[PDB]
């Protein structure tokens, strides 16, 4: 009775970053830091699972 259909209407789950959004989030938070850009973030997103 807290939900039922439309006590709250749109039931929206949140996924975890699959692979690509990990490098995206790393890019987002590393935007402020000064980087010597010898970094493939896709390596890091491809190794850090879940």
């Amino acid at each position: 009775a807290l939900l039922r259909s439309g006590r709250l209407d749109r039931k929206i789950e949140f996924p975890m970053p699959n692979e690509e959004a990990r490098a995206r989030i790393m890019q987002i938070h590393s935007r402020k830091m000064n980087v010597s850009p010898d970094v493939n973030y896709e390596e890091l997103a491809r190794c850090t699972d879940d």
Binding site: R4, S5, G6, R10, K11
Partner: protein, 375 residues
């Protein structure tokens, strides 16, 4: 050269409108200045009449008093229990007064909004007719129930799975009889204090006793109902006393008349058997999930004022619809409109209905245990 009449009338009409409005302002302030000096009075209730001159009253704010009338207070009016007025200093009785209203009642008396009648709901034509037969007929024509010589049922209990429109059926009654629906939400009653809730229950039962065709409606009972405890949290004591208020004065010795109580719950398994017996609540009235024709009925009720085209296999949508609610298929039509505004179609295509059905399928893979039959 005879324009002096226009000038004299101009100045005189300016001064006359000015005098009218300004003396009207001065007259408003004159009446409001005359009314300044008066002094208010004390609200009290009459316990009993002691002698011809002596009157025992207890105001709500504290102690008890013995005073008398002025000259012309017409002492036969003072029945024991009437609400009267008292002087602040001299403290004698001034004027017999009509009874209190306690505007907590008013915020659940006047605040019925508009609604559409019982043709809006559907697929549950047993309960509609049955509630009509158990309520409207013993208040319109009691002699059908007196020629038989059998006491009419008093209390009705709506129950079932959540979202079957248990609220909107009573709301349709609140758009059918339109008489005195005291729709108590039954959660905003308790505030903090000691016996305030008991006094509010007394107030509601007096008010329902007086305005002879009253409809008592208490939604979401289980908060204030409970069952019983082995004496755990202390506030539960006053909870149970607040419930035993209802348990007494719904039955008492002075039987209620035309006091029809409409009740709705989310799970009726947790009620007190003190409340579960007949007499207080006569007939358990069960609502369940719509069937195929019933899902068809609610779907075509919601699909009325929706801009679309003549393509709608309602049988397909109801076929994928499986064990749903009043609001499930409402959510189907709502999300059908959502998917219509998705990609900006300005009509509702039939595939949007299937997308919304699969959205409902995503929704109700997180909900279960929808069968609470009491007792």
């Amino acid at each position: 050269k005879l324009l002096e009449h226009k000038e004299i009338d101009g100045r005189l009409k300016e001064l006359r409108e000015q005098l009218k409005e300004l003396t009207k302002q001065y007259e408003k302030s004159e009446n409001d200045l005359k009314a300044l000096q008066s002094v208010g009075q004390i609200v009290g209730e009459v316990l009993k009449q002691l002698t011809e001159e002596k009157f025992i009253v207890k105001a709500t704010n504290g102690p008890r008093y013995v005073v008398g009338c002025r000259r012309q207070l017409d002492k036969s009016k003072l029945k024991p229990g009437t609400r009267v007025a008292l002087d602040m200093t001299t403290l004698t009785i001034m004027r017999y007064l009509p009874r209190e209203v306690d505007p907590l009642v008013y915020n659940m008396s006047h605040e019925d909004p508009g609604n559409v009648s019982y043709s809006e709901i559907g697929g549950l034509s047993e309960q509609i007719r049955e509630l009509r037969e158990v309520i409207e007929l013993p208040l319109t024509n009691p002699e059908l129930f007196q020629r038989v010589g059998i006491i009419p049922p008093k209390g009705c209990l709506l129950y079932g799975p959540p979202g079957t429109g248990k609220t909107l059926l009573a709301r349709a009654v609140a758009s059918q009889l339109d008489c005195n629906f005291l729709k108590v939400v039954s959660s905003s009653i308790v505030d903090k204090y000691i016996g305030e809730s008991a006094r509010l229950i007394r107030e509601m039962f007096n008010y329902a006793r007086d305005h002879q065709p009253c409809i008592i409606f208490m939604d979401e009972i289980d908060a204030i109902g409970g069952r019983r405890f082995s004496e755990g949290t202390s506030a539960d004591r006053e909870i149970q006393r607040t419930l035993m208020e209802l348990l007494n004065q719904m039955d008492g010795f002075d039987t209620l008349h035309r006091v029809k109580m409409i009740m709705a719950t989310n799970r009726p398994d947790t009620l007190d058997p003190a409340l579960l017996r007949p007499g207080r609540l006569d007939r358990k009235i069960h609502i369940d999930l719509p069937n195929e024709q019933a899902r068809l009925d609610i779907l075509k009720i919601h699909a009325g004022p929706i801009t679309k085209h003549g393509e709608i296999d309602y049988e397909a949508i109801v076929k994928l619809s499986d064990g749903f609610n009043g609001a499930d298929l409402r959510n189907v039509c709502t999300e059908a409109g959502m998917f219509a505004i998705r990609a900006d179609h300005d009509f509702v295509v039939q595939e949007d209905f299937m997308k919304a059905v699969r959205k409902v399928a995503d929704s109700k893979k997180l909900e279960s245990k929808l069968d609470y039959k009491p007792v």
